């Protein structure tokens, strides 16, 4: 119900990336699946992959081996670990919330931007 | 996968106009077609789920009339607060591709 | 009319060196062991082998063998190549049709049989059915007579026989040979080969030849073989069979020593001074081939009716299990269950189409080298005779029974779309069954192969795995499967107007998805088109797979090693 | 040691009237046609028929046949009953184990073979494998020698042979008979029957008997048969086989006329004045039977390894098709798809268990009447030898491969529940395959029966029709199906902790039903228990179906008409 | 949403029975399935069978051949035709309304009683 | 089919009491367990769907706590307007059998 990111707004290329979405108003072990979204400059949205409520996860098959989502259930967090980051995917990142039965991205983050330069 | 061609990539309309945004799908979605509305500097607010339903927090002007592959959005007599970037989404498959996103303009 | 030959080397491995001799109008005999060339020389003189494997000549009355030689001569295979499911009058009207001239009268086709069936002594068994394991018929001693009459239609002067005694009893085979002895004086040159002969057989010949391990040991008339082998160093002891004493020489009461006797045989030297004097219509072809297997099809209830009894009973059991398929949450499982069960029947009963060609393989080989038909006339006829009716029927027996018991979609066209779709997948899985089994005499290999292939088609049909959820380097395999396209069509045929969430009109909105509350939501989720092309796409896929697999069956029957 | 007999009427239909004679210590021969009693009298004197079918007596040295007569005499079946997959040293240690005394030494088991294999001339082929179609071995002329040594272990004085010449070549069979002629003087009474004999065979006998259409025509020593039939009215012509001239009398160069000659035969009258002088351990039994088929099992890669290659490849293909089964809306179709595919494999590969008993049927019949084992010792041994290892392995090969590729439920116990469940349904479908095929020599019948039966079990397994939605006079049939209980258990094993509506925690509430958003909702809707008894209920159902179907297999092997 | 029965509150035995439930506020061809309920004296409820929105129907298998439900779509009615009526099933009858997705008998009739005597 | 034994066919409670009505099922229902409330002379008003949910038009006192086969209803501190005849229903299968229906009383 209430999501927010907090992470580095910059990175060196070809190393890694860490974001963190802390969920209040609701517990991420209770009901929903929890997914990340990036939006490029020259705005095109690109869903990235969800972690389920029970730790299972499915990632967007364009991003194979590069994205991983973990979770720290004891404080309602779920982490974006994006490795070998090219300078091209310098998109605005989001964490969002999926109902499963309604089917839609019901709740979203606030919006963190990542710039991949040197 | 399923790509969502919003073939009208932009428009140029005026106030009080019925504009009709298409969203051509590359496969049958069966009313699993969302609509969003990204004001600049924001995350996409959800507008229409189910391709015919509506989301609480909008007038009864936005109305999706879709069937099969030819899903579309109808905005009867738009307002000043409704220029934006309308993204259609399939949530049928797993790689949830969005549309290209049309963008309304004022002549 | 005589045969003659000189310096024959036959390899694939030379199991021969060279054989020299002539054969008079009389009774020509080839004896020896099974490992010897006694079965290979007879295929040479009857031109039943590869001519590139042949080396020497075959000279007949001062003329080589033309293309017309097979069309005026008869070779009779060792097993019963007759249609024991038919009768003698029916089977000799078949071999009259494909051998006599088109100009010749049906009266003449009535008479020339009766010049022969009267000659064979088969006037008692004219309309008597010849005989099957499951239909009692004529004794096997006249099954041998039945095949010889099949090879005496246009009066061939030159007769050939694969093993005229093996397969018959002792006094049974004598009545065959005395009939051939009656043929031995009517100007008919019989050239055959007998394993383990007898002196009752030996006392009636006119010429004789012995082979052993690809080596020649005798030539000339049959009386003087006992006269010659005395000079070889032996003596025929008191009360011994002479034709068995001729094999007493062979295996050490060595092969190189006995053949050097034959090089210095005076029976060879007269032949040496005899050989070097010598060496110095389609619509009619489909009119009767379609009839013959048709009466094979009527004259076997244990293969025709017994595959209808299975079809009617399992038509009724499936009628009782399902019975009025409900439009509730279980309705998707039942309707997709029966349609997966029908298509796999259609497919796993098409394994019984391999029973067709593999049994009829050895009859196909002898009848084409005889020249009874063009290969397409066999192939446009037998498919008209067996592929057509035995798969039109269970695609109607299933279709009439299980449609209105189960209550599948109560429209007029969808009854006939299902009727036609089961008809195609019956043909299509049969065509693959013909395409694999064409040119194979083994049953247990090809029956195993399709059993492997259909299982690897059962997976991709769409019930045991969802086809959209396969890794994309395997989702090209979903096109090579006959149970996909039929079962896609049957799911397209039936799941259109249906609903499965009772109380929940789903076609306007589906609230709360993951639900499958209409027939399209099941049908799209399987990865199946909803446009009306998506139905008939499956049929033109299946129609092409019929034509391709019949062509592979046509080429395998064309490019077969007939020799 | 002599045999003797008087006034034998054998019916089911009397194809005999009465046969009179004695047999000296020597070489006793029975000749005639195949329709005659030449194969039926030999089963009488070797007690291989129904004693209620027998009428007269069998008197041996002034004593009737005891129960000990089969345990000290040898009959050799016409086909190769040897283990061509083993070797001669291995197979004669088998027949030493079940025939020599338990008190006797293994040194004595080492020596008494070597008193016999040295006699047979088989010292070259002692450790040489005997021979299969797929493994090259010893020639068939010593396969015949191999079986005779199997029936010479405890030194039987009285030898019997079903057709010692048929199946062998001409000089091939003479090396058998000279070996038997060496046995003809060492105090061994050989009593046999030859179809189509020869004068090289005829010149070495001691006594002789002719049968034709159940009528007796000769008795006495073998030389005087040519002496007697001259007085019948015939004369043996110049250079004829005498043993073939003895069948020249039979079929008209009538039967009632020739037998009346024999009633007034002086060869009968001496016998008439001779007959009326006369008529006036289990652990060891399982120690070696389990070893013999075990070396059959190692000595056939084309049936043992070739069913592992199918298992490993289809283990890997199913590993590639499914590969990490997702917990989404398609996840139910895939997980229920593979588990239905595994159990039906387990079942449709158990049709290959009919290859076990039906091939080993004729060897089972001869070896029990010889008395090598109690029937349970055969039955607790061969199941230990072939039912145990060939079904423990693919229930581990499937289990190790497809578990962690597919990502089936990542717990320790559920890996072994699936391991054990596939092991039972492999046994259970094999037990039914043994229960049907016990006591049937035909393959094509029983293979068709289970193919009918498994299909009528496939429907009730739960995937193709929802079992709760069957009319209640058919929902009792859902208990008679082996693919139900395994597939019930595998669905019970895997669908417990699962979820299939991602984003939708369903275990507290399922809003918007018709949804199947957890594994229990799929599992109950199929009509399957959720209590932990509901898992093992299937196993004790399957465990009872093993014991019942083995008992039906045990009774059919017990109540079989062995005669 | 708004249901009401109107029929005979009495019948002769072993002939027939007719009830009629006229639906206002909603159209019976639109969404739901429509089912009948009887409640005996000595109160035990017994659901009787539903007609779907598209005319299909499923009846309670204790009542085979005796109940039938028709419909007259042009005025939103659906009929209870109960034949060969024993005097024992003299229950209070109801028409009711089933969601399908919620799963429960969401709306009910008013209550008609049928007494089967002579 | 599925029979729904409300084994406590009646009660005798007082006001402000927590009463617990059981509803033993003859098969797994998986939270498909309704609750109704028939005041005398009326049709059964729906009380609890889903065996854990609630229906709008009631206090937050009626609360179903069921699992597997042993579904039950908890009425914490009942009122005067809550005596009735509580029928539990399965809506898992098609022959939607109800419960016998308990009936509350006042001592
Ligand atoms: C299911 O509901 C939908 C709408 O919720 C119905 O669809 C349309 O309804 C309007 C109103 O009557 C009609 O004018 C249209 O013709 C309907 N369209 C279609 C395609 O039917 C729909 O009719 C309902 N289903 C049924 C079986 O009536
Ligand atoms: C799904 O939701 C239900 C409730 O909506 C959760 O079930 C109970 O939740 C409470 C609150 O944390 C716990 O105290 C109980 O122990 C939970 N019971 C069970 C049986 O889990 C449930 O935990 C949710 N699912 C998951 C996977 O967390
Ligand atoms: C293909 C299969 C083995 C044999 C199949 C079969 C075989 C004969 C048959 O009917 S039959 O006329 O040949 O008797 C029906 C079927 C239907 C399904 C069944 C299995 C599905 C998975 C599997 O391994």
| DSSP per position, D375-413 | HHHHHTTHIIIIITHHHHSHHHHHHHHHHHHHT----HH
How many Å apart are CA D384 and CA D365, to the nearest integer?
20
Largest Cα separation within chain D, whole Å, is 106
Q: Among partner residues C241, C337, C341, which is closest to D244 by beta-carbon distance?
A: C241
Give the DSSP letter of residue C60: E
Task: Please provide residue D40's backbone torsions phi and psi, each rounded to the nearest 5 degrees.
Answer: -95, -35
Chain A residue whose CA is closest to C509: A102
C456 in a domain, yes or no? yes
Q: Indicate if the alpha-carbon torsion angle D107, D113, D117, D119 is positive or negative.
A: positive
Cβ(A47)–Cβ(B103) under 8 Å?
no
**Chain D CB contacts of F93 below 8 Å:** 468
Q: Are residues C397 and C532 in the same domain?
A: yes
Q: Do B95 and A45 touch (CB under 8 A)?
A: no
Partners of chain C (3+ Cβ pairs below 8 A): A, B, D, E
With a CB cutoff of 8 Å and minimum separation 6, the contacts of C110 are: none
Task: Please provide residue D45's backbone torsions phi and psi, each rounded to the nearest 5 degrees.
Answer: -70, -25
Cβ(C194)–Cβ(C201) under 8 Å?
yes
Q: How many CB atoms are located within 10 Å of the residue D29 CB?
A: 26
How many Å apart are CA C154 and CA D167, to the nearest integer?
41
Distance of CA D464 to the CA centre of its chain: 36
D219 in a domain, yes or no? yes
How many Å apart are CA D151 and CA D96, to the nearest integer?
10
> Which residues is chain D interrupted after (C–N above 2.5 Å)?
12, 253, 280
For the CA atoms of C454, C456, C460, C461, the dihedral, rounded to the nearest 10 degrees, stands at: 10
With a CB cutoff of 8 Å and minimum separation 6, the contacts of C305 are: none
Chain B residue whose CA is closest to A111: B43
Q: Do B98 and A108 touch (CB under 8 A)?
A: no
How many Å apart are CA D31 and CA F44, to the nearest integer?
96
Q: How far is the CA of A30 from the centre of ligand 2 (A)?
A: 7
D300 in a domain, yes or no? yes
With a CB cutoff of 8 Å and minimum separation 6, the contacts of F87 are: E45, F6, F35, F36, F38, F44, F98, F99, F101
* Gap from C112 CA to chain D (nearest CA, Å): 34
Pull the structure tokens for residue F16.
């402000």
Q: Are residues C192 and C311 in the same domain?
A: no
* H helical segments located in C349-469: 354-359, 361-370, 375-379, 382, 389-392, 394-406, 412-437, 444-458
Q: Do D512 and E101 touch (CB under 8 A)?
A: yes
Number of domains, chain C: 2
* H helical segments located in D187-281: 199-202, 224-229, 242-245, 255-263, 266-278
Give the DSSP letter of residue B81: G
How many Å apart are CA A107 and CA A96, to the nearest integer?
6
3-class DSSP assignment, residue C435: helix
If contacts are CB pairs under 8 Å, which of residues 19-78 in chain E contact chain F?
A: 39, 43-47, 58, 60-62
- Give the per-residue SS3 of C300-334: CCCCCCHHHHHHHHHHHHHHHHCCCCCCCCCHHHH
**Chain D CB contacts of F91 below 8 Å:** 513
| Best residue of B95, B99, B104 to probe chain A, by most A CBs closer than 10 Å | B95
Q: Do A60 and B87 touch (CB under 8 A)?
A: no
Q: Which of D77, D70, D66 is nearest to D39 (CA)?
A: D77
Count how many Cα atoms sit within 13 Å of the Cα of residue A81 in the half-sphere of its side chain: 9
How many Å apart are CA C24 and CA C184, to the nearest integer?
11
Q: Which of C171, C196, C152 is nearest to C32 (CA)?
A: C196
Q: Do D520 and F53 touch (CB under 8 A)?
A: no
Give the DSSP letter of residue B104: -
* Gap from E76 CA to chain F (nearest CA, Å): 21
Q: Which of B102, B100, B101, B98 is nearest to B2 (CA)?
A: B98
With a CB cutoff of 8 Å and minimum separation 6, the contacts of A80 are: A7, A17, A18, A19, A20, A21, A36, A48, A67, A69, A93, A95
Residue D532 CB burial class (10 angstroms; 0-12, 13-18, ≥19): exposed
Cβ(C504)–Cβ(E31) under 8 Å?
yes
* Gap from E105 CA to chain D (nearest CA, Å): 14
With a CB cutoff of 8 Å and minimum separation 6, the contacts of D540 are: none
Pull the structure tokens for residue B26.
């590359």
Pull the structure tokens for residue D18.
């009465």
Give the DSSP letter of residue C352: G
By residue range, what is the domain housing residue C460?
284-558
Q: Are residues D345 and D487 in the same domain?
A: yes
* H helical segments located in chain E: none
Residue D442 CB burial class (10 angstroms; 0-12, 13-18, ≥19): exposed
Distance of CA A111 to the CA centre of its chain: 10
With a CB cutoff of 8 Å and minimum separation 6, the contacts of D231 are: none
D563 in a domain, yes or no? no
Do strands E105-108 and E92-98 pair parallel, antiparallel, or not at all (unpaired)?
antiparallel
Q: What residue owns the CA closest to ligand 1's atom 23?
A: E30
> Angle, to 10 degrees, between the axis of helix D140-150 and the axis of helix D88-97?
20
Pull the structure tokens for residue C111.
């008479």
| Best residue of D513, D523, D528 to probe chain F, by most F CBs closer than 10 Å | D513
Task: Please provide residue C191's backbone torsions phi and psi, each rounded to the nearest 5 degrees.
Answer: -130, 110
**Chain E CB contacts of C499 below 8 Å:** 52, 54
Cβ(B34)–Cβ(B49) under 8 Å?
yes
How many Å apart are CA E24 and CA E27, to the nearest integer?
7
Give the DSSP letter of residue E11: B
Ligand sitting nearest the alpha carbon of D351: 3
Number of domains, chain F: 1
Largest Cα separation within chain B, whole Å, is 39
How many Å apart are CA C556 and CA C359, to the nearest integer?
16
C113 in a domain, yes or no? yes
| Best residue of C466, C492, C524, C532 to probe chain B, by most B CBs closer than 10 Å | C524
- For chain A, the C-alpha Rg in angstroms (whole number) is 14
How many Å apart are CA C248 and CA C251, to the nearest integer?
7
How many Å apart are CA B48 and CA B44, to the nearest integer?
12
Q: Are residues C174 and C311 in the same domain?
A: no
With a CB cutoff of 8 Å and minimum separation 6, the contacts of C469 are: D326, D330, D334
Ligand 2 pocket check for A53: Cβ under 6 Å = yes
Q: What are the CA-CA distances from residue D28 to residues C235, D22, D120, D223, D425 (Å)? A: 30, 10, 20, 12, 53
Distance of CA C426 to the CA centre of its chain: 21
Partners of chain E (3+ Cβ pairs below 8 A): C, D, F
Q: Which of C494, F22, C455, F61 is nearest to D348 (CA)?
A: C455
With a CB cutoff of 8 Å and minimum separation 6, the contacts of C449 are: C436
Q: What are the CA-CA distances from residue D472 to residues C321, C322, C415, D292, D538 (Å)? A: 10, 12, 29, 50, 21
Q: To test the ligand 2 pocket, which listed residue (A26, A30, A52, A76) has its Cβ within 8 A of the most ligand atoms?
A: A30
User: Read out DSSP for chain F?
Assistant: ---EE-S-----B-TT--EEEEEEESS--SS-EEEEE--TTS--EEEESTTT---SSS-TTEEE---TTEEEEEETT--GGG-SEE-EEE-SSSS--BB--EE--B-
> How far apart are the two ends of chain A, measured CA to CA in Å?
36
Q: How far is the CA of B56 from the centre of ligand 2 (A)?
A: 29
Give the DSSP H or E segment for B107.
none
Beta-ladder partners of A51: A34, A57
Q: Are residues D340 and D450 in the same domain?
A: yes
Residue D461 CB burial class (10 angstroms; 0-12, 13-18, ≥19): buried
Cβ(D201)–Cβ(D243) under 8 Å?
yes
If contacts are CB pairs under 8 Å, which of residues 3-62 in chain B contact chain A?
A: 32, 34, 36, 38, 42-46, 49-50
Cβ(A98)–Cβ(A104) under 8 Å?
yes
Ligand 1 pocket check for E27: Cβ under 6 Å = no
Q: Do D502 and A50 touch (CB under 8 A)?
A: yes
* Gap from B86 CA to chain C (nearest CA, Å): 22
Give the helix, strand, coil percentages of chain E, each rounded to 5: 5, 45, 55
Ligand 3 pocket check for C345: Cβ under 6 Å = yes
Residue D557 CB burial class (10 angstroms; 0-12, 13-18, ≥19): buried
Q: How far is the CA of F66 from the centre of ligand 2 (A)?
A: 14
* Gap from F94 CA to chain D (nearest CA, Å): 10
Q: Among partner residues D468, D510, D529, which is closest to F31 by beta-carbon distance?
A: D510
How many Å apart are CA D143 and CA D294, to the nearest integer?
20
Q: Do D501 and A53 touch (CB under 8 A)?
A: no
Task: Please provide residue E2's backbone torsions phi and psi, each rounded to the nearest 5 degrees.
Answer: -135, 110
Beta-ladder partners of A78: A21, A71
Q: Are residues D45 and D107 in the same domain?
A: yes
By residue range, what is the domain housing residue F66?
1-107
With a CB cutoff of 8 Å and minimum separation 6, the contacts of C401 are: C312, C315, C316, C319
Count how many Cα atoms sit within 13 Å of the Cα of residue C188 in the half-sphere of its side chain: 23
For the CA atoms of C395, C401, C405, C410, the dihedral, rounded to the nearest 10 degrees, stands at: 50
Ligand 3 pocket check for C450: Cβ under 6 Å = no
Q: How far is the CA of D515 from the centre of ligand 1 (A)?
A: 23
How many Å apart are CA C508 and CA B66, to the nearest integer?
10
Q: Are residues C139 and C94 in the same domain?
A: yes
| Best residue of E34, E51, E67, E105 to probe chain F, by most F CBs closer than 10 Å | E105
Q: How far is the CA of D312 from the centre of ligand 3 (A)?
A: 21
Last residue of a domain, one of C253, C268, C300: C253
The method recorded for this entry reads: cryo-EM
Q: Among partner residues A50, A56, A101, which is closest to D504 by beta-carbon distance?
A: A101
For the CA atoms of C298, C302, C307, C312, the dihedral, rounded to the nearest 10 degrees, stands at: 100
3-class DSSP assignment, residue D299: coil
Q: How many CB atoms are located within 10 Å of the residue D414 CB?
A: 17
Task: Please provide residue C491's backbone torsions phi and psi, each rounded to the nearest 5 degrees.
Answer: -70, -30
Q: Do C510 and B31 touch (CB under 8 A)?
A: yes
* H helical segments located in D213-360: 224-229, 242-245, 255-263, 266-278, 282-287, 289-298, 306-321, 331-348, 354-359
Count how many Cα atoms sit within 13 Å of the Cα of residue C207 in the half-sphere of its side chain: 20
Q: Do E50 and C502 touch (CB under 8 A)?
A: yes
Cβ(D194)–Cβ(D29) under 8 Å?
yes
Ligand 1 pocket check for C497: Cβ under 6 Å = no
Give the DSSP H or E segment for C75.
strand C73-76
Q: Are residues D226 and D344 in the same domain?
A: no
How many Å apart are CA D555 and CA D390, to the nearest integer?
24
* H helical segments located in C129-281: 140-150, 170-183, 199-202, 224-228, 242-245, 255-263, 266-278
Pull the structure tokens for residue C120.
């064979």
Task: Please provide residue B27's backbone torsions phi and psi, each rounded to the nearest 5 degrees.
Answer: 165, 165
C259 in a domain, yes or no? no
Across the A:D interface, residue pairs with CB atoms under 8 Å apart total: 37
How many Å apart are CA D6 and CA D274, to the nearest integer?
11
Task: Please provide residue A63's backbone torsions phi and psi, each rounded to the nearest 5 degrees.
Answer: -105, 80
Beta-ladder partners of F22: F72
Ligand sitting nearest the alpha carbon of A53: 2
Ligand sitting nearest the alpha carbon of B65: 1
Q: How far is the CA of D508 from the centre of ligand 2 (A)?
A: 6
| Ligand 1: nearest atom to the Cα of E29 | 28
Give the DSSP H or E segment for B86.
strand B85-86
| Best residue of C326, C329, C500, C502 to probe chain E, by most E CBs closer than 10 Å | C502
Q: Are residues D250 and D302 in the same domain?
A: no
How many Å apart are CA D372 and CA F53, to the nearest integer?
73
With a CB cutoff of 8 Å and minimum separation 6, the contacts of D462 are: D484, D487, D488, D491, D526, D527, D528
Do strands D21-23 and B88-90 pair parallel, antiparallel, or not at all (unpaired)?
unpaired
Instruction: Tell whether E100 lies on the interface with C, counting CB pairs under 8 A.
Output: yes
How many Å apart are CA D144 and CA D176, to the nearest integer?
7
**Chain F CB contacts of D520 below 8 Å:** 28, 30
Cβ(C138)–Cβ(C128) under 8 Å?
yes
How many Å apart are CA D276 and CA D56, to the nearest integer?
13
How many Å apart are CA C281 and CA D320, to the nearest integer?
55
Pull the structure tokens for residue C523.
């049908």
Cβ(C9)–Cβ(C18) under 8 Å?
yes
How many Å apart are CA C53 and CA C16, to the nearest integer?
11
Indicate which CATH number applies to the domain containing D271.
Answer: 3.40.50.300
Q: What are the CA-CA distances from residue D196 to residues C147, D32, D200, D285, D290 (Å)? A: 27, 8, 12, 40, 40
For the CA atoms of D421, D424, D425, D426, the dihedral, rounded to the nearest 10 degrees, stands at: 120
C271 in a domain, yes or no? no
């Amino acid at each position: 119900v209430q999501l927010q990111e907090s992470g580095p707004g910059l990175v060196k290329p070809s190393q890694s990336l860490s974001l963190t979405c802390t969920v209040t108003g609701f517990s991420i072990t209770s009901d929903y699946a929890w997914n990340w979204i990036r939006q490029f400059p020259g705005k095109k949205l690109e869903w990235m992959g969800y972690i389920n409520f029970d730790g299972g996860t499915t990632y967007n098959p364009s991003l194979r081996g590069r994205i991983s989502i973990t979770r720290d259930t004891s404080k309602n967090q779920f982490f974006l670990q994006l490795r070998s980051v090219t300078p091209e995917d310098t998109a605005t990142y989001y964490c969002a919330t999926f109902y499963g039965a309604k089917g839609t991205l019901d709740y979203w983050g606030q919006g963190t931007s990542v710039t991949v330069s040197s | 996968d399923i790509v969502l061609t919003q073939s009208p990539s932009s428009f140029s309309v005026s106030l009080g106009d019925r504009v009709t945004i298409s969203c051509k799908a590359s496969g049958y979605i069966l009313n699993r077609l969302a609509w969003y509305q990204q004001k600049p500097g924001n995350a996409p607010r959800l507008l229409i789920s189910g391709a015919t339903s509506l989301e609480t927090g909008f007038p009864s002007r936005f109305s999706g009339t879709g069937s099969g592959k030819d899903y579309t959005l109808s905005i009867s007599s738009l307002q000043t607060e409704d220029v934006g970037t309308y993204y259609c989404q399939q949530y049928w498959s797993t790689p949830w591709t969005f549309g290209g996103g049309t963008k309304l303009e004022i002549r | 009319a005589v045969l003659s030959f000189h310096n024959i080397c036959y390899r694939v491995k030379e199991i021969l060196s060279n054989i020299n001799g002539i054969m008079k109008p009389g009774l020509n005999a080839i004896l020896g062991p099974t490992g010897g060339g006694k079965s290979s020389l007879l295929d040479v003189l009857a031109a039943r082998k590869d001519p590139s494997g042949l080396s020497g000549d075959v000279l007949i009355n001062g003329a080589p063998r033309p293309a017309n030689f097979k069309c005026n001569s008869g070779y009779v295979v060792q097993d019963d190549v007759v249609m024991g499911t038919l009768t003698v009058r029916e089977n000799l009207q078949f071999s009259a049709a494909l051998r006599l001239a088109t100009t010749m009268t049906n009266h003449e086709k009535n008479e020339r049989i009766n010049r022969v069936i009267q000659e064979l002594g088969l006037d008692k068994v004219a309309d008597s059915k010849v005989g099957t394991q499951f239909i009692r018929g004529v004794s096997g001693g006249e099954r041998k007579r039945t095949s010889i009459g099949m090879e005496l239609i246009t009066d061939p002067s030159i007769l050939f026989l694969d093993q005229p005694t093996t397969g018959l009893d002792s006094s049974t085979a004598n009545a065959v040979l005395l009939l051939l002895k009656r043929m031995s004086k009517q100007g008919r040159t019989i050239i055959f080969s007998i394993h383990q002969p007898r002196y009752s057989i030996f006392k009636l010949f006119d010429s004789l030849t012995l082979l052993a391990s690809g080596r020649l040991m005798f030539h000339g008339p049959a009386q003087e073989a006992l006269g010659y082998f005395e000079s070889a160093g032996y003596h025929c002891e008191a009360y011994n069979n002479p034709a068995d004493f001729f094999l007493d020489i062979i295996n050490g009461d060595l092969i190189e020593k006995l053949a050097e006797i034959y090089v210095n045989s005076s029976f060879y030297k007269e032949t040496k001074a005899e050989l070097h004097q010598l060496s110095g219509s389609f619509c009619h072809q489909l009119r009767w081939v379609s009839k013959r297997s048709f009466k094979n099809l009527l004259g076997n209830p244990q293969a025709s009716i017994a595959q209808i009894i299975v079809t009617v009973v399992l038509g009724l059991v499936i009628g009782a299990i399902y019975f009025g398929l409900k439009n509730d949450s279980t309705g998707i499982q039942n309707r997709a269950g029966v349609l997966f069960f029908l298509t796999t029947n259609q497919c796993f009963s098409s394994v019984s189409a391999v029973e067709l060609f593999v049994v009829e393989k050895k009859l196909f080989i002898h009848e084409y080298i005889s020249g009874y038909y063009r290969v397409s006339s066999y192939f446009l006829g037998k498919l008209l005779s067996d592929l057509l009716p035995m798969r039109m029927l269970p695609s109607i027996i299933f279709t009439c029974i299980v449609y209105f018991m189960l209550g599948l979609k109560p429209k007029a066209d969808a009854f006939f779309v299902m009727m036609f779709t089961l008809m195609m997948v019956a043909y299509s899985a049969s065509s693959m069954a013909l395409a694999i089994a064409a040119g194979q005499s083994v049953v247990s290999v090809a029956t195993l192969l399709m059993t492997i292939c259909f299982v690897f088609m059962m997976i991709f049909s769409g019930l045991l795995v969802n086809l959209t959820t396969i890794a994309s380097w395997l989702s090209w395999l979903q096109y090579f499967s006959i149970p996909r396209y039929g079962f896609t069509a049957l799911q397209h045929n039936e799941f259109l107007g249906q609903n499965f969430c009772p109380g929940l009109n789903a076609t306007g909105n589906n609230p709360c998805n993951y639900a499958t509350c209409t027939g399209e939501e099941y049908l799209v989720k399987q990865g199946i088109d909803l446009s009306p092309w998506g139905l008939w796409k499956n049929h033109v896929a299946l129609a092409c797979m019929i034509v391709i697999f019949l062509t592979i069956a046509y080429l395998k029957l064309l490019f077969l090693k007939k020799y």
